[PDB]
UniProtKB/Swiss-Prot annotation, chain A:
It is linked to Immunodeficiency, developmental delay, and hypohomocysteinemia: An early onset multisystem disorder characterized by immunodeficiency, recurrent infections, developmental delay, poor growth, intellectual disability, and hypohomocysteinemia. Some patients manifest congenital cardiac defects. IMDDHH inheritance pattern is autosomal dominant. Belongs to the bZIP family. CNC subfamily. It comes from the Eukaryota. Coiled coil: none annotated. The ETGE motif, and to a lower extent the DLG motif, mediate interaction with KEAP1. Induction: Down-regulated by ENC1 via a proteasomal ubiquitin-independent protein catabolic process. It is found in: Cytoplasm, Cytosol; Nucleus. Heterodimer; heterodimerizes with small Maf proteins. Interacts (via the bZIP domain) with MAFG and MAFK; required for binding to antioxidant response elements (AREs) on DNA. Interacts with KEAP1; the interaction is direct and promotes ubiquitination by the BCR(KEAP1) E3 ubiquitin ligase complex. Forms a ternary complex with PGAM5 and KEAP1. Interacts with EEF1D at heat shock promoter elements (HSE). Interacts via its leucine-zipper domain with the coiled-coil domain of PMF1. Interacts with CHD6; involved in activation of the transcription. (Microbial infection) Interacts with herpes virus 8 protein LANA1. Transcription factor that plays a key role in the response to oxidative stress: binds to antioxidant response (ARE) elements present in the promoter region of many cytoprotective genes, such as phase 2 detoxifying enzymes, and promotes their expression, thereby neutralizing reactive electrophiles. In normal conditions, ubiquitinated and degraded in the cytoplasm by the BCR(KEAP1) complex. Ubiquitinated in the cytoplasm by the BCR(KEAP1) E3 ubiquitin ligase complex leading to its degradation. In response to oxidative stress, electrophile metabolites, such as sulforaphane, modify KEAP1, leading to inhibit activity of the BCR(KEAP1) complex, promoting NFE2L2/NRF2 nuclear accumulation and activity. In response to autophagy, the BCR(KEAP1) complex is inactivated. This is Nuclear factor erythroid 2-related factor 2. A motif (ETGE motif) lies at residues 11-14. It comes from Homo sapiens. Widely expressed. Highest expression in adult muscle, kidney, lung, liver and in fetal muscle.
Length: 16, 285
C-alpha cells in the first residue's frame, strides 16, 4: 500500500 | 542428435526465450518464444515433448506466479497449453516417473509449498499426491530407480541441507541422509544412478561445490567443484555428462554453461548462453 522499494532475492537475483 | 533446451529465465524481468544447444557442434538455435514470460520454472521431457512447468512472470508491471503447464513439440516448433496445476509454483522442482510429471514444492506469494501433484499426459490431468515432510522452494528434484527425491531448498525461514524421498507405490515420503552442505536453488539431477546436487545458496554465499548421493551406501560425497559458483541454475544430462546453465552468484547473472564429465571428474566451460540469466527451465530431447 506504500509503494515500497523492491527487494533483492539473494538466491535468484530477482527484484520484487 | 538430442539437444539441450533452455526456456525462460530472468534478467531484469522474466524472459520468454526458448533456445537449443547442440553439444556435438557447439551451436545455438533460437526457437519459438514461450507464450507467457517465465522464470523460476522447471523443464522436463516426456515422450519426446518438452514441458515448461510453474515459475512466475516477474516484470515491472507486477508479478504473477504461474500454475501453468505448457508443452513444446520440437517437430512443430509450437507451444501448446496444457491443464494447469492446483496452485501456482514459483521455484518449483519436477521429476518424471512412468511417464507422469511430478510437480514438487515451490511458492505462491509468501506460501512455501509442501504439496506435490502428478500430471498424466494421456489424460491431461493433475492429481495431488502425499505432501513432502518439509516445505521446499528452490528444491532440487530427481528420479532414481522409480523413486522421487526432493533435495535442499528453502522452507520459508531456513535454507535446507535435508532431503527426502517418495515411494509412489506407498504414496509416502521419508527423510534420507542430509547433504554435507545447505543448498537452496541447487541443480539436482541423476547421472549413472547417483543423485548429484550442484551449486546453490548456503544462506550466506553461492556455492561451486557439487556432491552426489549413492542410495546403496546412503552417503553424500563431494566431486570436483564447478568453476563458477551459482544458484538458480538449470541442470540436465546429455550423453552421460551433466550440463549446468546460468544462475546468479550475488553479483552477476551467469551466461556460463559448464559440463561435468564423470569419467574424468572434471568440469569445463563448453559454451555460453546468448545472455546471462537465472531461473531457467532446461531439458534434453
Amino acid at each position: 500500500a506504500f509503494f515500497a522499494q523492491l527487494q533483492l532475492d539473494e538466491e535468484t537475483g530477482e527484484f520484487l | 542428435g538430442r539437444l539441450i533446451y533452455t526456456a525462460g529465465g530472468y534478467f531484469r524481468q522474466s524472459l520468454s526465450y526458448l533456445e537449443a544447444y547442440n553439444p556435438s557442434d557447439g551451436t545455438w538455435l533460437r526457437l519459438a518464444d514461450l507464450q507467457v514470460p517465465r522464470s523460476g520454472l522447471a523443464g522436463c521431457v516426456v515422450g519426446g515433448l518438452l514441458y515448461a512447468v510453474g515459475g512466475r512472470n516477474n516484470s515491472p508491471d507486477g508479478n504473477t506466479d504461474s500454475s501453468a503447464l505448457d508443452c513444446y513439440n520440437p517437430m512443430t516448433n509450437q507451444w501448446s497449453p496444457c491443464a494447469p496445476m492446483s496452485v501456482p509454483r514459483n521455484r518449483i522442482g519436477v521429476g518424471v516417473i512412468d511417464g507422469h510429471i511430478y510437480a514438487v514444492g515451490g511458492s505462491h506469494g509468501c506460501i512455501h509449498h509442501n504439496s506435490v501433484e502428478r500430471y498424466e499426459p494421456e489424460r491431461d490431468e493433475w492429481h495431488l499426491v502425499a505432501p513432502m515432510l518439509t516445505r521446499r522452494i528452490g528444491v532440487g528434484v530427481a528420479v532414481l530407480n522409480r523413486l522421487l527425491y526432493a533435495v535442499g531448498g528453502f522452507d520459508g525461514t531456513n535454507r535446507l541441507n535435508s532431503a527426502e524421498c517418495y515411494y509412489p507405490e506407498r504414496n509416502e515420503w521419508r527423510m534420507i541422509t542430509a547433504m554435507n552442505t545447505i543448498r537452496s536453488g541447487a541443480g539436482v539431477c541423476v547421472l549413472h544412478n547417483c543423485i548429484y546436487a550442484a551449486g546453490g545458496y548456503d544462506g550466506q554465499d553461492q556455492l561451486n561445490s557439487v556432491e552426489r548421493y549413492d542410495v546403496e551406501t546412503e552417503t553424500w560425497t563431494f566431486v570436483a567443484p564447478m568453476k563458477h559458483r551459482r544458484s538458480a541454475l538449470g541442470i540436465t544430462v546429455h550423453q552421460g555428462r551433466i550440463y549446468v546453465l546460468g544462475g546468479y552468484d550475488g553479483h552477476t547473472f551467469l551466461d556460463s554453461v559448464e559440463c561435468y564429465d564423470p569419467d574424468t571428474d572434471t568440469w569445463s566451460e563448453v559454451t555460453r548462453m546468448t545472455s546471462g540469466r537465472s531461473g531457467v527451465g532446461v531439458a534434453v530431447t
